[PDB]
Amino acid sequence: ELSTLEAEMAVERKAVEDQRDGELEARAQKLEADLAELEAEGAKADARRKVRDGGEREMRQIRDRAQRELDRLEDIWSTFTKLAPKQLIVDENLYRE
Structure with a gap:
């Protein structure tokens, strides 16, 4: 079953x-849109840079x-491909998965 499982x-x-x-494309369009709004509503100096840093961080x-x-x-x-008896799985999540 190796081929089928590898495909899935x-x-x-x-x-x-x-x-x-x-998701990333969405956040980029939101970033550029919000910046366009901040430039549209008056303007500011460091605020645009700060919110850009926030978008990049997100x-x-x-x-x-x-x-x-x-x-x-x-x-x-x-782990599954090299799985062999006597092996230890210390992560509960990895074993359940």
Whole structure:
């Protein structure tokens, strides 16, 4: 069943990646839109820079969440492919998954 399971795995990875790109694109459009609003309503100096830093930080958060999940999946697949008797699984989540 190695081929089928590897395929389903790859599909799940792609699902996570597509979700990541969608969320990030959304946050980028929201960032540029909000900046356009701050420039539209009067203006400010450091406030636009600060809110830009906030948007960039949030995008970093989204990318890093999806990256942690991708590493989780990679770890599941590595653990199952090399799975052999006498091996110890110290993570409850990894064993349940």
